[PDB]
Design a protein around this ligand. Structure first.
Ligand SMILES: CO[C@H]1CN(S(C)(=O)=O)[C@@H]2CC[C@@H](O)[C@H]1C2
Ligand SMILES: CO[C@H]1CN(S(C)(=O)=O)[C@@H]2CC[C@@H](O)[C@H]1C2
Length: 284
């Protein structure tokens, strides 16, 4: 079926939970043996969220190459994403090592450091220009260059220096700051505006390594971001945009990381975002 009318048909019939459970039943199951090794327990935030072995990002280190991060490679859309958990106190150096080694331009953050009164990820970037951060375990230096605070999101320019080679690179930090502590946003308008700002920066384009996108577990809000982006790109590429099937695209993405889209409300929100986004692209 088309998307917008399949949407109204699920609303009128109130069957979002049944649709979402079907997706959960059909989703791929692949091994995640490296994630479960005892030496990696303090590298995982949640015991039930792990990268598959076949798609995990490897650190370029001979001691321990493990990080909780997955490469989502979308062949028809010609887009790739790295989805990862929010960094832990003992993985902030690994996180920036990955950004460096994978040649990423941008980092997309969809959570606040504290939500619901608890810590959802480490404070992993510097908050003042004159107070830079040094990660001694991976030999990197990180400096805040500029910060632009808007009503729904903040964009930061950062400098990452590999202290071994003295090479430097400019990284863009795109921080969506207004996702509610409970539920999903009422309108997708600010989330779509944010997606378009990431696109306009070059961070999603083939001349760079894959964008790094995270929330707390790296599957819920993060899944919503890449699902919406890929569906909108496919609607632009194909002769028949109504042939894009958001459930099929989500199942394709779940071949590369488990659990993408965590609730039926997140599934409905993803439909809403793609539907509204397709009107603005036109060609409007
Ligand atoms: C519209 O709100 C509810 C609709 N359904 S429903 C009844 O269509 O399945 C789901 C139930 C839980 C709540 O998050 C949302 C999603
Ligand atoms: C930024 O990553 C560097 C960290 N080291 S490290 C942790 O051994 O100092 C590894 C060795 C080679 C270097 O290029 C990469 C990976």
């Amino acid at each position: 079926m088309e998307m917008e009318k399949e949407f109204e048909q699920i609303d009128k019939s109130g069957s979002w939970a049944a649709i979402y459970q079907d997706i959960r039943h059909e989703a791929s199951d692949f091994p995640s043996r490296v994630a479960k090794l005892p030496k990696n327990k303090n590298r995982n935030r949640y015991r039930d969220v792990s990268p598959f072995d076949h798609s995990r990002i490897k650190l370029h280190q001979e001691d321990n190459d493990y990080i909780n991060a997955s490469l989502i490679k979308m062949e028809e859309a010609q887009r790739s994403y790295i989805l990862t958990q929010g960094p832990l106190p003992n993985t902030v150096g690994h996180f920036w090592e990955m950004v460096w080694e994978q040649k990423s331009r941008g980092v997309v953050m969809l959570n606040r450091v504290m939500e619901k009164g608890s810590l959802k990820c480490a404070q992993y970037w510097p908050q003042k220009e004159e107070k830079e951060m040094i990660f001694e375990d991976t030999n990197l230096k990180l400096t805040l260059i500029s910060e632009d605070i808007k009503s729904y999101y903040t964009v930061r320019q950062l400098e990452l220096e590999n202290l071994t080679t003295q090479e430097t690179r400019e990284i863009l930090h795109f921080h969506y700051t207004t996702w509610p502590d409970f539920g999903v946003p009422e309108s997708p308008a600010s989330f779509l505006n944010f997606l378009f700002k990431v696109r306009e920066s070059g961070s999603l384009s083939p001349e760079h390594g894959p964008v790094v996108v995270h929330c707390s577990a790296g599957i819920g809000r993060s899944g919503t971001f890449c699902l919406a982006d890929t569906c909108l790109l496919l609607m632009d590429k194909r002769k028949d945009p109504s042939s894009v099937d958001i459930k099929k695209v989500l199942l394709e993405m779940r071949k590369f990381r488990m659990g993408l889209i965590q609730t039926a409300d997140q599934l409905r929100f993803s439909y809403l975002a793609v539907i509204e986004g397709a009107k603005f692209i036109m060609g409007d």
